[PDB]
């Protein structure tokens, strides 16, 4: 199949759901609620797995780990704690300067996480102790700087409060690439959030003037430090003027989905050709909060005031599984069937 089309139910059990994220495999979905409750479901049989009522405070950010065991907390008292899918116990606890927006682990080591405040440069820590590595940003004027790892774990792409991108190394801070985009006519505007794919090096630019640009993680390294690249694909809207809230990718880098912030909508473009191909809808007067794409099957989870809707392709039942010798035809199918009228290879049964 392909991109989803139909509604297909919900899970309106837990009150006041707020955020959501997946693992690598696509079978784990934790939800940081409005009161610290962290709830996991099932996907194959769809049962509530484990409520983790961790804090008395609400949660604003989470992330899964590479082994499928470890999580990370972000409350309104800056508490970052290491969790487990076997026990579910608190490990670490300390206080940042007051704002914490989003965290992100290192991909090829579960030692390091990248933590981002509001009015400060993003800070990378470890999980052994409270060691933190100071990351320098070029402006250092407003300090509203976003940062994220790439796919494979080579560099760290950062985004300032003014419209200039730095490409640093994860430990030695090697500024090796930078670029400024010609934002419209006069004003260069800030970046909300940059996310990254799973097949290749494609990524997206989400500005604050409602234009999505498509780039690659090799062309900027080819252009070196202080180069001028062009967008591989420009994505925008004109009719409703469409503010954005959340951005992510499709399964193997095929399509691009992006939830909106006004009309409770989901749009599906194509990275290959470059045109919109399907518009989704839902409840008319809700408020879209978090959108997650499912990595090995076309499922999209959307939180709008607790409700998590799962657009899941609307499978169609038929015959030919009951009696696999009878073919349910459509019209008259006439023919004649026959022109002529009437080894010890040890395969492991335990091949796990």
């Amino acid at each position: 199949q392909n991109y989803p089309e139909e509604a297909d139910g919900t899970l309106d059990c837990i009150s006041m759901a707020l955020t959501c994220t997946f693992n690598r495999w696509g079978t784990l979905l934790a939800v940081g609620c409005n009161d610290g409750r962290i709830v996991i479901w099932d996907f194959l049989t769809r049962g509530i797995a484990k409520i983790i009522s961790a804090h008395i405070h609400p949660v604003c950010s989470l992330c899964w780990s590479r082994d499928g065991h470890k999580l990370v907390s972000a409350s309104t008292d800056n508490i970052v704690s290491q969790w487990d899918v076997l026990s579910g116990d608190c490990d670490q606890r300390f206080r940042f300067p007051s704002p914490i927006l989003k965290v992100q682990y290192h991909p090829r080591d579960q030692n390091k996480v990248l933590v981002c405040p509001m009015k400060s440069a993003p800070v990378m820590l470890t999980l052994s102790d409270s060691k933190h590595v100071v990351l320098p940003v070029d402006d250092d004027s407003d300090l509203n700087v976003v940062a994220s790892f790439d796919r494979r774990g080579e560099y760290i792409y950062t985004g300032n409060a003014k419209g200039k991108i730095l490409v640093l190394k994860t430990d030695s801070q090697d500024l090796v690439a930078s670029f400024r985009v010609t934002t419209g006519t006069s004003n260069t505007t800030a970046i909300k959030s940059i996310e990254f794919a799973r097949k290749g090096s494609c990524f997206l630019i989400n500005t604050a003037d409602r234009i999505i640009r498509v780039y690659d993680g090799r062309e900027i390294l080819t252009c070196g430090r202080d180069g001028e690249p062009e967008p591989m694909q420009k994505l925008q809207d004109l009719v409703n003027r469409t503010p954005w809230k959340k951005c992510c990718f499709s399964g193997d880098g095929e399509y691009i989905v992006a939830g909106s912030a006004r009309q409770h909508a989901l749009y599906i473009w194509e990275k290959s050709i470059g045109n919109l191909v399907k518009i989704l809808h839902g409840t008319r007067g809700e408020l879209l909060l978090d959108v997650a794409w499912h990595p090995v099957r076309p499922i999209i989870a959307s939180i709008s005031s607790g409700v998590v809707s799962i657009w899941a392709q609307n499978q169609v039942e038929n015959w030919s599984a009951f009696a696999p010798d009878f073919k349910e035809l459509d019209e008259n199918v006439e023919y004649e069937e026959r022109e002529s009228e009437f080894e010890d290879e040890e395969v492991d049964v335990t091949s796990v």
Binding site: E334, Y335, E336, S340, E341, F342
Partner: protein
């Protein structure tokens, strides 16, 4: 000798030269309405267009048989398969002979003094096999059941292309 008007398979591609049968998809068998009663009637079958992947089962059949009977269904109809020469008679499949070439002049014959039989595979006077023996007496119209729509002609003249040598026959200028 002209063919039939009503005693024929209707949905076949009837050619306007009135000496050539062109088939369809499937085994719908035309029986041309001029066949033997007693004694001898020999004619040849000139082949114009025989494409591959064809099962040209040729032989003898009666007006008791179905029009939709493939030639090789019962004790009355005979069979000569292209692939591996196999006979299919009374629903018995035994790999009998070899195949056959493309572009020859075919033709079968029965010899019955009024019975002693010559039911033997005939092709340019070269024997491919003694087919069967000792039929009952009746009407035997020639039967054509094809798999493709192959353009194949028919002959009736006394000066044959490759007749059976020293043949006892009757000319087709008497009852056809």
């Amino acid at each position: 000798v002209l063919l039939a008007l009503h005693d024929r398979a209707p949905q076949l591609k009837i050619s306007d030269d009135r000496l050539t049968v062109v088939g369809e998809k499937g085994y719908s068998m035309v029986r041309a309405s001029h066949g033997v009663r007693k004694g001898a009637w020999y004619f040849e079958i000139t082949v114009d267009e025989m494409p591959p992947d064809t099962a040209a089962r040729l032989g003898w059949s009666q007006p008791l048989g179905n029009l939709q009977a493939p030639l090789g269904y019962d004790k009355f109809s005979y069979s000569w398969r292209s692939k591996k020469g196999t006979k299919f008679h009374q629903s018995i499949g035994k790999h009998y002979s070899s195949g056959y070439g493309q572009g020859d002049v075919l033709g079968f014959y029965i010899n019955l003094p009024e019975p002693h039989s010559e039911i033997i595979f005939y092709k340019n006077g070269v024997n491919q096999g003694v087919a069967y023996k000792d039929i009952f007496e009746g009407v035997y119209f020639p039967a054509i059941s094809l798999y493709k729509s192959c353009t194949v002609s028919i002959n009736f003249g006394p000066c044959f292309k490759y007749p059976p040598k020293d043949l006892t026959y009757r000319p087709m200028s008497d009852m056809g």
